[PDB]
Structure formats: structure tokens, C-alpha cells
Design a binder for these strands. Structure first.
Ligand SMILES: [K+]
Ligand SMILES: [K+]
Ligand SMILES: [K+]
Ligand SMILES: [Mg+2]
Ligand SMILES: [Mg+2]
Length: 136
RNA sequence: ACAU
DNA sequence: CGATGT
């Protein structure tokens, strides 16, 4: 503890896993939605969580903001730190789009810098992350 | 087991 | 109940 209220919170939403994947980013203090990704027909929860963090890094850098990012995904936080999304999702024609976005997000991480702290949202102490979709 |  | 991940 405790919550850094001056932050951006991100989360994935899906219809199936693998299935249709979307994500959004919100102001932790207010819940204002700051970005939302158009649904991607097939992806995994963890690919979506990864894309959401990277989009948040890009969003904050473009705006010269030093705010931290909260994610509830141990996996996606590690993948961003490693600059490598270690997804098991088959690469085929159906999954081409999500894998293109994941590849492009890795490419961005490998060509840009950032100081943004990427913090674990402590769901067991604080309840659901503010960017949650309410689908569970 | 933990995080989704 | 099923799936994605460390
Ligand atoms: K949900
Ligand atoms: K959760
Ligand atoms: K498991
Ligand atoms: Mg989540
Ligand atoms: Mg959620």
C-alpha cells in the first residue's frame, strides 16, 4: 500500500480466451476513460494486457506525463520488462492481426525509452482495478 | 502456488 | 467448468 492515485490504470476485456480482445486505460482517480482499443477478433488475455500497458506507455510519453501505470497482470508486467511477449497463441491466419500488434508493440519498446513505473495493482487489498470491464 |  | 501465463 497505498494507491498512487496520480496514475493510469489499464485492463483487458475479452469474449472467450482465446477470443475477442479489447483494452482500455483510465484515470485511476476519476475513472475517466482515456483510450480504448477497437476489438480484435482473436487474441489471448495476456496479449491484450501486454498491448494495454504498451499503449499506456506510448500515450503517456506523447503527453510528456511521468505518471505510473497500474496493471493487475503479473504476466504482462514481466513481458513489458523483458520487451518480449512470450505468448503460446498459435501464429496462423486467424491470429495474424493480434500477432502483428504484439510484434509492433515489442518493436516500439525496442526503439524508444521511458521512465514510467509499471506497478502491480493489488486486487486482493484494493478491489478490482479501475479499468476493469465488469465481465466476471 | 501465484497473477489473470 | 474452460483458458492464459510465471
Ligand atoms: K472483468
Ligand atoms: K482481476
Ligand atoms: K493454471
Ligand atoms: Mg486484468
Ligand atoms: Mg479485469
Amino acid at each position: 500500500e497505498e494507491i498512487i492515485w496520480e496514475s493510469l490504470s489499464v485492463d483487458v476485456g475479452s469474449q472467450g480466451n482465446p477470443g475477442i480482445v479489447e483494452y482500455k486505460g483510465v484515470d485511476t482517480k476519476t475513472g475517466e476513460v482515456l483510450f480504448e482499443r477497437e476489438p480484435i477478433p482473436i487474441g489471448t488475455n495476456n496479449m491484450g494486457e501486454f498491448l494495454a500497458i504498451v499503449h499506456g506507455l506510448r500515450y503517456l510519453k506523447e503527453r510528456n506525463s511521468r505518471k505510473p501505470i497500474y496493471s493487475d497482470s503479473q504476466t504482462a508486467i514481466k513481458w513489458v520488462k523483458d520487451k518480449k511477449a512470450k505468448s503460446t497463441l498459435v501464429r496462423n491466419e486467424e491470429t495474424a492481426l493480434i500477432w502483428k500488434l504484439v510484434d509492433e508493440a515489442e518493436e516500439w519498446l525496442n526503439t524508444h525509452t521511458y521512465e514510467t513505473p509499471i506497478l502491480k495493482w493489488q486486487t486482493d487489498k484494493w478491489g478490482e482495478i479501475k479499468a476493469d470491464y465488469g465481465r466476471k
